[PDB]
């Protein structure tokens, strides 16, 4: 169906312990495919998925240079933001950026992204128009002015509409056997008495890709949102994901509860019950 390429940039200052570390990781959907770490012994853009390995040395060299330049730019930027907030040189700070493109099933651009955060709080974001910015505060307004003066939104728009989607489509083709394969969840319901009055029904989804999934409990055909415990979807380490949903039910009322599962890899949504 729909696809994204996203890069996730994290830069972290560490006063008294050298210069800020910069790491960039790149994803197509839920699959990481590259990394760059300024703390590595020899920082290089490195493959993290098998399908990207076929790219020639030109790809790795070009991206490595971009990341090496970005390392210095983020260090310069961390200095600037420290000043924008009148902060001491003693404290550690974090600058994060996420950028990239989304395309539809036809591979056409749905939208682009370029968002930044400072110390875990929204700082500045490129609007969906790819032509204007939203600055969170007067510090970020300084950045906005610099970027407006220097045509940065135009650069982002050109990148997102061009390079980003072109590379995403290329990656999707090279890794089609995995990137364009949805693996359905393997599902089951477990049961454990809590007391004489209650028991937990836990609905499991294992081995699915991508991570997007809907796992719900209904009682008597009505969603049990407030009473359901949903764990965060978690990576298995084999590309796939895991999740469970649990509800506490009165003893003997188990068959009034149904677990519902929606996922892209399923030919049809599932309805499960505890099978004693």
């Amino acid at each position: 169906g729909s696809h994204s390429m996203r890069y996730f940039h994290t830069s972290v200052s560490r006063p008294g312990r050298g210069e800020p570390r910069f790491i960039s990781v790149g994803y197509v959907d839920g699959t990481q495919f590259v990394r760059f770490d300024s703390d590595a012994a020899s920082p290089r853009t490195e493959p993290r998925a098998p399908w990207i390995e076929q790219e020639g040395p030109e790809y790795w060299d070009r991206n490595t240079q971009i990341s090496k330049t970005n390392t210095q730019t983020y260090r310069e930027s961390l200095r600037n933001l420290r000043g924008y907030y009148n902060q001491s040189e003693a404290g550690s700070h974090t600058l994060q950026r996420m950028y990239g493109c989304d395309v539809g099933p036809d591979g056409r651009l749905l939208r682009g992204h370029d968002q930044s955060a400072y110390d875990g709080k929204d700082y500045i974001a490129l609007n969906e128009d790819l032509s204007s910015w939203t600055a969170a505060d007067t510090a970020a307004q300084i950045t906005q002015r610099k970027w407006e003066a220097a045509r940065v939104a135009e650069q982002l728009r050109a990148y997102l509409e061009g390079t980003c989607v072109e590379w995403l489509r290329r990656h999707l083709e090279n890794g089609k056997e995995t990137l364009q394969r949805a693996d359905p969840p393997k599902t089951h319901v477990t049961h454990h008495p809590i007391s004489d009055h209650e028991a937990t029904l836990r609905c499991w989804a294992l081995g699915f890709y991508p991570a997007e999934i809907t796992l719900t409990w209904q009682r008597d055909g009505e969603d049990q949102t407030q009473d359901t415990e949903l764990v965060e979807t978690r990576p298995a380490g084999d590309r796939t994901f895991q999740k469970w949903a649990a509800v506490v039910v009165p003893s003997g009322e188990e068959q009034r509860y149904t677990c519902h599962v929606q996922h892209e890899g399923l030919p049809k949504p599932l309805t499960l019950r505890w099978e004693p």
Binding site: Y7, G26, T45, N63, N70, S77, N80, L95, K146
Partner: peptide, 8 residues
Amino acid sequence: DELEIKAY
């Protein structure tokens, strides 16, 4: 490819 970003 990634993008070469501008200073904040």
